[PDB]
Amino acid sequence: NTRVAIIGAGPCGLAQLRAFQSAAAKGAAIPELVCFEKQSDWGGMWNYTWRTGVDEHGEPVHGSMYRYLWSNGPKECLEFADYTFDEHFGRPIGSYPPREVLWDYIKGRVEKAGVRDYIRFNTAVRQVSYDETSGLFSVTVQDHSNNRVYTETFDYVVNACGHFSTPNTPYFEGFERFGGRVLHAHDFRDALEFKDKDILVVGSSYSAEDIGSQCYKYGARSITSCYRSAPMGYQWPQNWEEKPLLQRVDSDTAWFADGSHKRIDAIILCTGYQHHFPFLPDSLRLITENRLWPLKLYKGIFWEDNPKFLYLGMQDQWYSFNMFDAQAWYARDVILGRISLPGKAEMQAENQAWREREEKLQTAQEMFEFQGSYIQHLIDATDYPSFDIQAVNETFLAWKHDKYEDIMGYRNKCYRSLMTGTLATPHHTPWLDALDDSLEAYL
Amino acid sequence: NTRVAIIGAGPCGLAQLRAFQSAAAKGAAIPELVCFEKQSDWGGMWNYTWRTGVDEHGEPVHGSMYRYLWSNGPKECLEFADYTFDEHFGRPIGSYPPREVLWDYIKGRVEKAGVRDYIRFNTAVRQVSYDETSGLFSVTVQDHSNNRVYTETFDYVVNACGHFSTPNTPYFEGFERFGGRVLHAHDFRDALEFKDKDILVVGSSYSAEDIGSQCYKYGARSITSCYRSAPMGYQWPQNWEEKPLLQRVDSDTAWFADGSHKRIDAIILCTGYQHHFPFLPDSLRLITENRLWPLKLYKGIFWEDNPKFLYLGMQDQWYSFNMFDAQAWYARDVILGRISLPGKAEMQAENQAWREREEKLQTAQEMFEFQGSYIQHLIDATDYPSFDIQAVNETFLAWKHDKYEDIMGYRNKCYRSLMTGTLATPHHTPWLDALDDSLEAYL
Numbered sequence: 023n024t025r026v027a028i029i030g031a032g033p034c035g036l037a038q039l040r041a042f043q044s045a046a047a048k049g050a051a052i053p054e055l056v057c058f059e060k061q062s063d064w065g066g067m068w069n070y071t072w073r074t075g076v077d078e079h080g081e082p083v084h085g086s087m088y089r090y091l092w093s094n095g096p097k098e099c100l101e102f103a104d105y106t107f108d109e110h111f112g113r114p115i116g117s118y119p120p121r122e123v124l125w126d127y128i129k130g131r132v133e134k135a136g137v138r139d140y141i142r143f144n145t146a147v148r149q150v151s152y153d154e155t156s157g158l159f160s161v162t163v164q165d166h167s168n169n170r171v172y173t174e175t176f177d178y179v180v181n182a183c184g185h186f187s188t189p190n191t192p193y194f195e196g197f198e199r200f201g202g203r204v205l206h207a208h209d210f211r212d213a214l215e216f217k218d219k220d221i222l223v224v225g226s227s228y229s230a231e232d233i234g235s236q237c238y239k240y241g242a243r244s245i246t247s248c249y250r251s252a253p254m255g256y257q258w259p260q261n262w263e264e265k266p267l268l269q270r271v272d273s274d275t276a277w278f279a280d281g282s283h284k285r286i287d288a289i290i291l292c293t294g295y296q297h298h299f300p301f302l303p304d305s306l307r308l309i310t311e312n313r314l315w316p317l318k319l320y321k322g323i324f325w326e327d328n329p330k331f332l333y334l335g336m337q338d339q340w341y342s343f344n345m346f347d348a349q350a351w352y353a354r355d356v357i358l359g360r361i362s363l364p365g366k367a368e369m370q371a372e373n374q375a376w377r378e379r380e381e382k383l384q385t386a387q388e389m390f391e392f393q394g395s396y397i398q399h400l401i402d403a404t405d406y407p408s409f410d411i412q413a414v415n416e417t418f419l420a421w422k423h424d425k426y427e428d429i430m431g432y433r434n435k436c437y438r439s440l441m442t443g444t445l446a447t448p449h450h451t452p453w454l455d456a457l458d459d460s461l462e463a464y465l
Numbered sequence: 466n467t468r469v470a471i472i473g474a475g476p477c478g479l480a481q482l483r484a485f486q487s488a489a490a491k492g493a494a495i496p497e498l499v500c501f502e503k504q505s506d507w508g509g510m511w512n513y514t515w516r517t518g519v520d521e522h523g524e525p526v527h528g529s530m531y532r533y534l535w536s537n538g539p540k541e542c543l544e545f546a547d548y549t550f551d552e553h554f555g556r557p558i559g560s561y562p563p564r565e566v567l568w569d570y571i572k573g574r575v576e577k578a579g580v581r582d583y584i585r586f587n588t589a590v591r592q593v594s595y596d597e598t599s600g601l602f603s604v605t606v607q608d609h610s611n612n613r614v615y616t617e618t619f620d621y622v623v624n625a626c627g628h629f630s631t632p633n634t635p636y637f638e639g640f641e642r643f644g645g646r647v648l649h650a651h652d653f654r655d656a657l658e659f660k661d662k663d664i665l666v667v668g669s670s671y672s673a674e675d676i677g678s679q680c681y682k683y684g685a686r687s688i689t690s691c692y693r694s695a696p697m698g699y700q701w702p703q704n705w706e707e708k709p710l711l712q713r714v715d716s717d718t719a720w721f722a723d724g725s726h727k728r729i730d731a732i733i734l735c736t737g738y739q740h741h742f743p744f745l746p747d748s749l750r751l752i753t754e755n756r757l758w759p760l761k762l763y764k765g766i767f768w769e770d771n772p773k774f775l776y777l778g779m780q781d782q783w784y785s786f787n788m789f790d791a792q793a794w795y796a797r798d799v800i801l802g803r804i805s806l807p808g809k810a811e812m813q814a815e816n817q818a819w820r821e822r823e824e825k826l827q828t829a830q831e832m833f834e835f836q837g838s839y840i841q842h843l844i845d846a847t848d849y850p851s852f853d854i855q856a857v858n859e860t861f862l863a864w865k866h867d868k869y870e871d872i873m874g875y876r877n878k879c880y881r882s883l884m885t886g887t888l889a890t891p892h893h894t895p896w897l898d899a900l901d902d903s904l905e906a907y908l
């Protein structure tokens with residue numbers, strides 16, 4: 023028969039396994055599936071590790087999540103249409119669960135699907151090549167359980183390796199003279215490390231917002247944030263100041279674009295991440311900034327130069343889990359032969375049409391509605407349940423307004439599931455005081 | 466003609482270029498040489514970076530050196546026989562220079578040799594394969610200057626990528642519950658980060674000795690060290706306690722094998738490094754612990770399954786720079802056809818003979834004399850100057866006794882060059898008080 027390689031057992035890889043299992047449960051013949059995962063367990067970014075830099079086997083540490091991390095959007099926006107919160111938890115819960123609670127939810131679905139046996143854990147993909155004549159990809163991997171490098175062939179490769187793990191780490195004048203810790207958001211683990219310290223966060227997106235907020239919540243003496251161009255602009259607490267871009271640092275002091283200065287103990291670069299695919303030749307290698315519409319990906323998925331090489335989840339994310347499902351189901355239907363792809367020139371013209379719309383977006387609302395409309399297109403093409411994109415959009419709108427209202431209070435609010443209609447119930451403790459991050463303490 | 470790939474422009478790679486240039490200066494025809502270096506400049510481990518984890522291009526950070534690092538052995542033990550300290554510095558200096566001063570020395574030789582133009586910087590080796598019929602290696606690299614992956618063929622590959630950059634990072638019960646920083650020695654940058662903090666160093670070799678010592682010198686409140694089996698055993702200062710192995714950690718406290726405990730702010734794993742060659746297939750991939758005599762390396766250099774694949778500097782190090790020269794000169798003479806290699810079975814028998822001697826070593830003296838005798842064998846086979854191994858051995862003996870005498874004072878002592886006979890002169894400031902690490906301040 024035919025063979026599919028899946029790189030990664032995070033949400034996207036797991037969605038891809040779930041897609042095939044769902045078809046198989048309803049009598050479809052499916053390919054052989056091999057999912058290569060470098061970590062010891064599934065969950066991707068949702069799997070926490072204390073490790074930083076490089077893991078015990080010498081691979082770059084994948085994990086960017088930190089202690090005390092909670093859902094940064096309404097859980098109702100990322101609900102699986104085919105495995106509801108009601109089915110998983112059997113009661114209502116808060117709209118903004120800690121990492122461990124959503125990890126439990128993600129695992130719950132693939133536990134139920136019985137797909138764990140497709141996965142080869144502790145295995146890092148090292149190289150991918152393609153042979154024109156056989157139409158096969160050769161995938162070379164290192165099995166760290168046995169310290170052995172091996173290669174197998176596959177008809178399709180689905181790259182679900184993520185793009186929020188390889189840091190974008192810009193130098194600033196004087197980092198080599200500064201006496202405090204300099205790290206990337208990717209290396210941030212326990213905010214208690216910065217208790218009673220004066221912290222600088224460099225950046226103006228979610229990592230800056232949230233890492234700064236954890237430092238606040240867990241007793242940092244002061245937060246300073248700085249932006250390259252656009253301030254985050256929220257009303258910050260008393261001990262937080264937002265400044266224009268860092269110019270330089272000396273042994274202990276940071277100097278900003280406006281000529282102001284601050285004594286700081288540590289610098290956290292919240293400067294985003296790179297799409298980094300060291301295991302790909304240029305012929306297969308997506309090169310893009312973090313955005314809603316990278317080019318060369320037909321339906322945001324199929325590599326236009328070789329559409330038997332697929333990318334999942336490589337867009338920037340408003341939607342997340344149910345976008346990955348939408349992608350995984352479309353990918354599956356194409357691999358099964360149910361949906362055929364057009365010719366390259368047509369794929370290129372359509373990708374460019376999406377790009378032109380992408381380039382016009384200005385407002386947050388335009389941006390999540392763009393991605394909503396992309397997902398609507400995918401879900402209409404397959405048997406993934408066509409859920410209510412418009413109502414999810416309205417939830418995202420409400421969340422944005424909650425964050426404006428109170429950047430430290432938005433996680434206390436409650437939203438209705440668009441899959442089941444059940445309202446989320448208030449959490450037992452306000453976010454700011456909910457110091458314990460465990461699944462036990464939350465439930 | 467013929468082509469040689471060299472992986473890395475650290476001391477070993479540079480030694481390899483210097484070896485060929487030295488032969489060429491005296492009329493030898495030499496191969497085309499391409500040295501691939503992932504960093505932006507030469508020097509290897511001696512090139513300092515503030516970066517930790519992964520570099521700006523997404524490659525694991527190579528650098529393990531930290532602020533305030535000085536020579537941990539007498540400089541007279543690592544002198545180049547073909548480029549003396551006298552020639553480079555034109556006067557005597559201390560026996561234990563800061564990193565920047567020996568970097569200057571290393572660069573000085575290859576500046577004089579004019580070999581920089583062989584090197585392709587910002588280029589990471591990604592894969593190596595070998596073709597039986599052509600007898601060529603295919604070396605695939607990523608050029609980060611241009612974001613392009615390319616492959617070229619070579620008759621020989623000399624792997625000079627080091628083995629003190631990929632950390633050995635063991636888990637200890639509770640690391641995911643501890644509130645302070647957990648890092649490896651590889652990530653240690655500025656000891657001022659730990660000023661007034663209670664530090665734990667895990668390990669009992671050079672990284673534990675020296676990182677603990679920097680923390681001491683730069684005002685850590687206390688140092689705790691712990692050993693897996695053998696204590697370091699030096700007489701430590703008042704605020705330093707050596708303990709048996711860490712058993713576990715809670716939110717702020719470490720618990721040891723003897724039942725004792727200590728509140729700690731940060732944990733630094735000084736637990737060594739891995740030989741990690743992700744760019745090699747198993748057919749070419751050396752698997753070894755850090756030791757004086759890994760197997761499968763004929764004359765400690767030639768991969769016994771394919772001796773056109775060479776490893777430099779993969780032994781544990783008492784000797785360093787002039788061992789790498791000795792290796793590089795032997796490698797060069799074999800590549801030039803001046804020295805022929807015996808058959809595999811003979812290579813295996815001889816490697817095993819070295820191993821049997823290696824396995825019997827117990828004392829520090831036995832260990833550096835073993836490596837001395839290995840180097841004597843290499844230097845006698847080529848035109849590298851046959852320098853006085855016995856006197857270098859006696860210097861190593863004297864250094865060991867100086868460290869016993871005073872683990873914070875040994876860097877104040879002076880030793881005679883075995884290349885020129887000139888005595889090192891006392892430094893202007895005692896190590897403990899010499900807070901400034903610059904080349905300027907030292908000279």
Ligand SMILES: Cc1cc2nc3c(=O)[nH]c(=O)nc-3n(C[C@H](O)[C@H](O)[C@H](O)COP(=O)(O)OP(=O)(O)OC[C@H]3O[C@@H](n4cnc5c(N)ncnc54)[C@H](O)[C@@H]3O)c2cc1C
Binds near residue numbers: 061067068093
């Ligand atoms: C710090 C952080 C917080 C977040 N918080 C939220 C949130 O609250 N809500 C939300 O909806 N989204 C959040 N996200 C978004 C996140 O991207 C998605 O939730 C989701 O994890 C993406 O799934 P993925 O499978 O595409 O990638 P990932 O979850 O990153 O998984 C990629 C997988 O590929 C594996 N892998 C990588 N390279 C290789 C290789 N060479 N060989 C083998 N395996 C490999 C990894 O180990 C990993 O398991 C967050 C992201 C980050 C970085």
Ligand SMILES: Cc1cc2nc3c(=O)[nH]c(=O)nc-3n(C[C@H](O)[C@H](O)[C@H](O)COP(=O)(O)OP(=O)(O)OC[C@H]3O[C@@H](n4cnc5c(N)ncnc54)[C@H](O)[C@@H]3O)c2cc1C
Binds near residue numbers: 785
């Ligand atoms: C923290 C520390 C302190 C030390 N202090 C001393 C001392 O005081 N005295 C002493 O004699 N020795 C010291 N050493 C020993 C050190 O190993 C040697 O001095 C010497 O640096 C080894 O040279 P090398 O060229 O084998 O390896 P390295 O100096 O490590 O150089 C390896 C090179 O290969 C490059 N590289 C790696 N992988 C790739 C790739 N895939 N593609 C392209 N390039 C790559 C690296 O960027 C680097 O330039 C120290 C070592 C460490 C780790």
Ligand SMILES: NC(=O)c1ccc[n+]([C@@H]2O[C@H](COP(=O)([O-])OP(=O)(O)OC[C@H]3O[C@@H](n4cnc5c(N)ncnc54)[C@H](OP(=O)(O)O)[C@@H]3O)[C@@H](O)[C@H]2O)c1
Binds near residue numbers: 190224226
């Ligand atoms: N659940 C949570 O609480 C949580 C926490 C952290 C992260 N996350 C998730 O992690 C993902 C990534 O978010 P992110 O914020 O890390 O990345 P991001 O959204 O890609 O944003 C990158 C930030 O870096 C800035 N930047 C880039 N280069 C810079 C430079 N040289 N100097 C200064 N600033 C620079 C950008 O500024 P410009 O925009 O001006 O270029 C932007 O503010 C998202 O999915 C996010 O939701 C979630």
Ligand SMILES: NC(=O)c1ccc[n+]([C@@H]2O[C@H](COP(=O)([O-])OP(=O)(O)OC[C@H]3O[C@@H](n4cnc5c(N)ncnc54)[C@H](OP(=O)(O)O)[C@@H]3O)[C@@H](O)[C@H]2O)c1
Binds near residue numbers: 629668670736737
């Ligand atoms: N110039 C300088 O001042 C300086 C500073 C730092 C490093 N260096 C150099 O860096 C190189 C590496 O030295 P290194 O000390 O990092 O490595 P190393 O010499 O390989 O020693 C590794 C240490 O880790 C211990 N260890 C290993 N696994 C462990 C575990 N699971 N738990 C507890 N302990 C464990 C070992 O104990 P056992 O031996 O009991 O196994 C040993 O003490 C050397 O060339 C060194 O000179 C130089």
Ligand SMILES: [Mg+2]
Binds near residue numbers: 312
């Ligand atoms: Mg951006």
Ligand SMILES: [Mg+2]
Binds near residue numbers: 755
């Ligand atoms: Mg060891």
